[PDB]
Point group: C2
Chain length 375, copies 2
């Protein structure tokens, strides 16, 4: 319940573990998982990917001070780069004074693309599909009733066209599916294959690809922070000046893709480590994050920074966050299961909300640093 | 070296390791590193990042069959998702028949950004900097004399302007630096801080940010592959039909960002694992890759696929690839050092070339699967 971890940064790893062991009430066996190497059995490892000849380790750390919608959370991170954990913890600390981080998210919605070719009337074919939308949605939904009972399932169908391409005219259907606590790939791919035949019948063309889109722009996670001028006071700068500089730094990233790429990288320095820690696919999160950053036809910043009516620094982070609590290595990796135990997350979207708060804090630290450094 | 690794997929991890051990001539000490857990000492781990309480493992695998510019290479990969290693190995295998992968790259060039504000004459200030470009380049080239004798160093300066910004007018200088075998961040950031004072004097404004740009578009790595129709016909599909479908798949990715994001993700499924294996920063490679994919204003495909004059399928992958043989975890992690040993790479750009070939092969497999 209290994530402030005093002196944590100077406690030996063992001491730190013990600590985390107590405030979370961790089981004996659970502490053993991080106290001795080899938590990932070779036969579990050998079953995960192919041509396995061993394992590879990265430091497992915990960021402190985080507070999500008023409640404290400890955050596990796996990465090789220094400063990330510290910066995240420090900004999280400044965040608590003004209420911590405020988050929210959309329903866990993923797209499954169903590409159709060979139709001479793609535009007309599109209306035929929309005409029988509910018929397509039902076929897809009778392929996984458990999910429907669990509160998920196909909720809609969008169809897009690309009549003129070097390869001919293309029609692309998008199955919109609520995947509850899964990242969604197989739930979605599965349904895509189940409707493909019916779509062929309705359009008269042939389905080419049936697969999820990593541009999960219907599964957004949101986070907000607020920092006051008092908190940003350094030896040589006024907390106000620093706020103004951070604003100049954000503007620079909003206009220059060379700065934006770097700016967003910092955001991912905070997010990716939590993804690995929970056994999730970091390539999926990365692709969705960057593709979304250039949705305006201009590669820009995923976060926003402004000075509010009180003169306070307020930042935002809204982005796609496809992540899961079940699925793949999230279940088979003992440490992934433990990370979820440390986080206390009950839904995939809850984990997603924590991800953007950490990403927002990481961006903040990076900018505060650059903004406060002297010539 | 012969990277066939026959029956490798079915050998036990121990057998696979021994096999990699003979084949490479690794010492008992080196094999010991993958044969027992804990290759990464806590005190090494504890010094790597902050608030450490332990370690986290991921499978360490080796993709087979790769051939770079005629020479065989074994490729280490660390990832949690299945199919990646197998797909990469299988496409590499098809690639050998037609010469394997042909690669190349630019010099290891990185940008260091030096943002300048507080001036009412940015456009004019820019010419003043260009006027003394050489004076700036030399100052920077002293902050790191070792780099220069190794064959690297600041090689140029570009200056860009942003006249109207809701925050005022902005001038941004770009130091172009050859970082040899480093990824470059600290080499570049240091030089940026060394010139910032001189730039302030020349423009009259004040330096805000001084930091490298992760959009490493001056450090590109290139890979090519060729597959014949014979190699691509299944029990149910004709090779040419398959080549044609792959072509339809590429076209789809070139126009639809929803497909491109997925298409490019697959490319990174192949690249990121090699990055982690060598202790490199995977966020840096990811950011540069995707930012580069939408440079034209439209988020598209990093790879290209075409049918050449003899009807053969030919793909390419050109993209920024900032990686290092030295720097950070690449040196302190015993397994990172071992991965470089297995790779046999002598320069950072050589590792970069292997990265795009693996990324190209991964994209290929994904597409062959879906059109099949």
């Amino acid at each position: 319940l209290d994530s402030r971890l005093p002196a944590f940064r100077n406690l030996s790893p063992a001491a730190r573990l013990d600590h985390i062991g107590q405030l979370l009430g961790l089981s004996h066996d659970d502490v053993s998982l991080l106290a001795n190497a080899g938590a990932l059995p070779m036969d579990i490892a050998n079953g995960m990917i192919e041509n396995v000849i061993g394992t590879f380790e990265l430091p497992y750390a915990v960021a402190s001070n985080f507070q999500i919608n008023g409640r404290d959370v400890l955050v596990p991170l796996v990465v090789e780069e220094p400063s990330i954990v510290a910066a995240a913890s420090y900004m999280a600390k400044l965040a608590r004074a003004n209420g911590g981080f405020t988050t929210s998210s959309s329903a866990p919605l993923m797209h499954a693309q169903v590409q159709i070719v060979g139709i001479q009337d793609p535009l007309n074919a599109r209306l035929s599909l929309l005409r029988r939308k509910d018929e397509i949605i039902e076929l897809a939904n009778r392929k996984d009733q458990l999910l429907n009972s669990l509160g998920g399932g196909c909720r809609d169908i969008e169809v897009h066209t690309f009549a003129d391409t070097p390869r001919g005219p293309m029609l692309v259907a998008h199955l919109i599916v609520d995947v509850r606590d899964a990242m969604g790939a197989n739930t979605v791919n599965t349904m895509a294959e189940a409707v493909a035949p019916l779509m062929e019948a309705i359009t008269g063309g042939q389905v080419r690809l049936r697969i999820l889109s990593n541009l999960a722009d219907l599964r957004l996670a949101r986070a907000q922070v607020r920092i006051t001028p008092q908190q940003l006071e350094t030896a040589e700068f006024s907390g106000e000046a620093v706020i103004e500089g951070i604003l100049d730094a954000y503007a620079f990233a909003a206009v220059d893709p060379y700065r934006a790429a770097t700016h967003n990288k910092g955001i991912m320095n905070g997010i990716d480590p939590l993804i690995v820690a929970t056994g999730n696919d970091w390539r999926a999160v990365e692709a969705g994050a960057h593709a979304y950053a250039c949705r305006s036809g201009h590669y820009g910043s995923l976060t926003t920074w402004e000075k509010d009516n009180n003169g306070h620094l307020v930042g935002t982070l809204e982005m796609p966050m496809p992540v899961g609590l079940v699925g793949g290595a999230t279940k088979t990796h003992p440490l992934a299961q433990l990370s979820l135990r440390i986080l206390g997350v009950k839904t995939a979207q809850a984990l997603a909300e924590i991800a953007v708060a950490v990403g927002l804090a990481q961006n903040l630290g990076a900018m505060r640093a650059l903004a406060t450094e002297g010539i």
